[PDB]
């Protein structure tokens, strides 16, 4: 009956994934997999087994990979041979086709399911974007992110000479165009002008309107709040000017965690293989009998 | 290669379905099925065979039912035994579970696919609504329709003593609450007060803020423009106040036709059985190979 889930990683996504699994009545949290295992166990993991390797856990249906994107394929290729399903929020848009092709034969060989790139973008937004395209298959779509923190752009800014700490905000200016507001703590003896020239030189910033401000504390300006505005204007049949929009004001990691739990659930109801979320019936994302959910939602 | 589609019915949906099939490069319009056949063939149906029964058409992969909702099950139960797939926009929310259970065994017996209730509501909106629920499975969803014409409420108003012609507008007041603006041509010797009391007495109007106005012409106030605002406010895991919204300003019949063509396409890629759109991967709604579509949209 209840789905037996393991969480691999305890970054922000991992913490919010525990909360998402705890809140889902149709789930059992078997344990959390950390490199450091049970050592210095956080207070909120008291009730759960914490281990160094997933083999130390018993009867795992699905592994939720709360790991960095660069680590997703490695952990998947290692957990699939155990006859265990994997879900991840792998967020490098350019690598998604290759990541899917790689896992596909491995997934089939081991009669197991991998659902990749299942955050809100990629993931949830990917579904809405695909539906919107279908409603008017001629015309233009735009994905407008924020205001919110960009982990990618934040890490990139942190890595530059003179930067002790950095937060990069993504701001939507519409039609897929973004403004970047970078807030930096300066390392002793570095100037704002130097750090600014170094940040704006990087491809991640050089093609976007970028503002770099110095601050006493980066932590004092952090907020996990984020958003999207998906816009489509186009043609149904030959009927012009069909307009549709989708928007979110959400907690970024909290939502990603909830979608990961949803695809963990969905993975139990697919034929073996690797899937993106646009290949998953949305009803499989929810708990309950198909008929009760169709009455409620269709 | 190209999908061979028949259109059953040539009301407004039927006209817009021809345009949607014409615009889809991966489709071939075999013919249109009218009660009256080819008899008074409209100018825009010149290039196409028009017949009284679908048996007169050859090599039909899928029948698009542009029929009234009360006629959908009848036409489906008659076209499935021919080994032909059916798609429809059956829009009676209360009957959808029973309509699905009825076709399921018939669909399986004849190795064929039925996709039911595939307009924008039910249908397209049903998908978004289901995704939004998944993003925050605790909290409240609302479906807010219009401004636009209600076929149901318009027919209901037309049927009342004193009403020569009627148009009922649906207006969204938020949180699933609607205002109804009914415009009537009065029959000889009937008063606004009489017609008003008769309209507001009907369950379709008695629980909604309703305004009835007299007009010289109902046709002079008609517009096929319609819309929706889907709202969800709820919890991801234990993280409160997750907000998301989906909106459309669309041509009503034009959109329904395009979704019907999309599920006609989707029906070619499912195991035999009856499906609502929340049971269909959104990628099957679009033309092209999965990899090209995943690169573009995920």
UniProtKB/TrEMBL annotation, chains A, B:
Principal EC category: oxidoreductase
Gene3D superfamilies assigned to the protein according to its UniProt record, in alphabetical order: Dihydrodipicolinate Reductase, domain 2, NAD(P)-binding Rossmann-like Domain
Subunit comment: Homodimer.
Entry annotated with the keyword Amino-acid biosynthesis: yes
Coiled-coil residue spans: none
One GO BP: lysine biosynthetic process via diaminopimelate
Binding site for substrate: 170, 180, 226, 252
Stored InterPro entries: Diaminopimelate_DH_Ddh, Gfo/Idh/MocA-like_OxRdtase_N, Meso-DAP_DH_C, NAD(P)-bd_dom_sf
Pfam family, one: DAPDH_C
Domain named Gfo/Idh/MocA-like oxidoreductase N-terminal: residues: 3-85
GO-annotated molecular function: diaminopimelate dehydrogenase activity; nucleotide binding
Classification via NCBIfam families: DAP-DH
Positions that bind NADPH: 10, 12-13, 34-35, 67, 69, 75, 121
EC number: 1.4.1.16
Protein's name according to its UniProt entry: Meso-diaminopimelate D-dehydrogenase
């Amino acid at each position: 009956k209840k789905i037996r889930a393991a969480i691999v990683g305890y970054g922000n996504i991992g913490k919010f994934t525990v909360e998402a699994v705890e809140a889902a009545e149709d789930f059992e949290l078997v344990g959390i997999v950390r490199r450091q295992g049970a050592e210095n166990k956080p207070a909120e993991l008291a009730p759960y087994k914490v281990v160094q390797d997933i083999k130390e856990l018993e009867g795992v249906d699905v592994a939720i990979l709360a790991t960095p994107s660069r680590s997703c394929k490695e952990y998947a290729e290692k957990i699939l041979p155990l006859g265990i399903n994997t879900v991840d929020s792998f967020d490098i848009h350019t690598d998604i086709v290759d990541y899917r092709s790689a896992l596909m034969p491995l997934c089939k060989e081991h009669h197991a399911v991998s659902i990749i790139s299942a955050g809100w973008d990629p993931g949830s937004d990917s579904v809405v974007r695909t539906l919107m395209q279908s409603l008017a298959p001629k015309g233009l779509s735009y994905t407008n992110f924020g205001p919110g923190m960009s982990m990618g752009h934040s890490v990139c800014a942190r890595s530059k000479k003179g930067v002790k700490n950095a937060l990069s905000m993504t701001i939507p200016l519409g039609e897929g165009i973004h403004r970047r507001m970078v807030y930096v703590e300066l390392e002793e003896g570095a100037t704002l002008d130097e750090v600014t020239k170094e940040i704006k030189a990087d491809p991640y910033f050089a093609h976007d309107e970028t503002h770099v401000m110095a601050v006493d504390s980066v932590d004092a300006v952090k907020d996990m709040g984020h958003g999207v505005h998906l816009v489509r204007k186009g043609v149904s049949g030959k009927t012009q000017n069909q307009r549709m929009e989708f928007s979110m004001s959400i907690n970024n990691p909290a939502l990603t965690a909830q979608v990961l739990v949803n695809v963990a659930r969905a993975s139990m109801h697919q034929q073996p293989g690797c899937y993106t979320m646009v290949e998953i019936p949305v009803i499989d994302l929810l708990a309950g009998e198909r008929e009760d959910l169709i009455k409620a939602l269709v």
